[PDB]
């Protein structure tokens, strides 16, 4: 309940215009994520006059207001097409893992830097019973001191918001066997 | 004094209040916050009554 | 004073309510809100009974 | 007994407790969870006190 | 009465609660709703006694 009224309460304590701009967010991130993905590459008028542009700044501020004072470990799921890996290492219906697939994954992701950029919801724990389970690649990610985290709730759990603009390194990856299903978690 | 003769004291029932189940987020079954007398009226109120 | 004499007082159960576990988020193993009371009338309308 | 004669009861407070105000964006505050008692000693040792 | 004469009273203990620590998101220690009842039932069903 600690992190609930946590939550709960850093999202009074901020503008109506970012309260608006997360509000907005707890139903429309798919387009306001590939907003925050692709929002660069226009012109300035074009930037500027867009009319998802300004909340997305609003949201954005929201992140940068509650920065970490230490490293904190973050888990979330992730396609495999997000590292370059254009098939499907298992169908979502099976349970295993080949091992060809697993080590064409490994093979394809030894040694490469992958940036990132937009809007991302993550956990503070591993995804068990009831959590969303929706690819066979989970990744376990370090942010670093100084990194804007925001908390939230959808109507019935809480997530955090953060926006990513790094790039990330995988180290080494496992097979994990979750409620009994295969999956594979990456470390970077 | 009433009691101590032909008197009888008679219980009724004004109303019933309960639970129901529904499963959360996980396959688990919850009764907690799911009261029946939010639904009564309304049954009361669409229905016809068979005995 | 019928308490006196060869009568006795005699206990019987009319119902026990009690918890189950689950692990949650974190692997720690939660027996709070998990009422066996929820399942019971399920179990007995699905199952037959061995003695 | 001693106390009707000269004896007088004397009253002295040992401390107070009581919430701040915290404000937003907009003019809403929030004085519940804001203790005071939390920033006494803080604020008691890193002053110097003027009367 | 039968207490003032050569009886005496034994204490014996049915069961203990109590809680055991763990660390939440940050550093910090959480001995709350971490209930050591919850895994008494699960270490003596796994495990041998020795003394």
């Known amino acids: ?37 692709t929002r660069q590459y226009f012109y300035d008028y074009q930037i500027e006059s867009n009319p998802r542009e300004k909340e997305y700044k609003n949201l954005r ?3 940068s207001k509650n920065k970490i004072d230490k490293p904190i470990n973050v888990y979330y799921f992730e396609s495999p097409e997000k590292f370059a890996f254009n098939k499907e290492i298992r169908t979502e219906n ?20 992958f940036k990132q950029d937009g ?25 670093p001191k100084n990194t804007g985290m925001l908390p939230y709730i959808n109507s019935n759990d809480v997530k955090t918001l953060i926006e990513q603009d ?18 594979i978690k990456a470390e970077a | 004094k009433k009691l101590d003769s032909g008197k009888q004291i008679k ?30 009226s309304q049954i009361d109120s669409v229905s016809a009554s068979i005995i």
């Open chain 1, 166 to 183: 790094y790039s990330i390194k995988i180290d080494k990856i496992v097979r994990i066997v979750i409620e009994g299903k295969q999956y």
């Open chain 1, 1 to 37: 309940q600690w992190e609930k009224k946590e939550a709960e309460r850093v999202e009074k304590n901020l503008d109506t215009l970012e309260k608006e701009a997360l509000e907005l967010y707890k139903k429309d991130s798919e387009q306001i994520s590939n907003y925050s993905q």
């Open chain 1, 61 to 63: 501020n929201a992140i």
């Open chain 1, 119 to 143: 809007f991302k919801d993550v956990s503070l724990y591993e995804p068990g019973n009831g959590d969303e389970k929706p690819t066979p690649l989970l990744i376990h990610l370090k942010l």
């Open chain 2, 11 to 40: 219980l009724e029932t004004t109303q019933v209040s309960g639970n129901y189940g529904t499963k959360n987020s996980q396959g688990q079954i919850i009764t907690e916050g799911n009261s029946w007398s939010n639904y009564i």
């Open chain 1, 94 to 113: 099976q349970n295993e893992i080949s091992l060809e697939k697993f080590n064409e994954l490994k093979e394809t992701i030894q040694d490469k830097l």
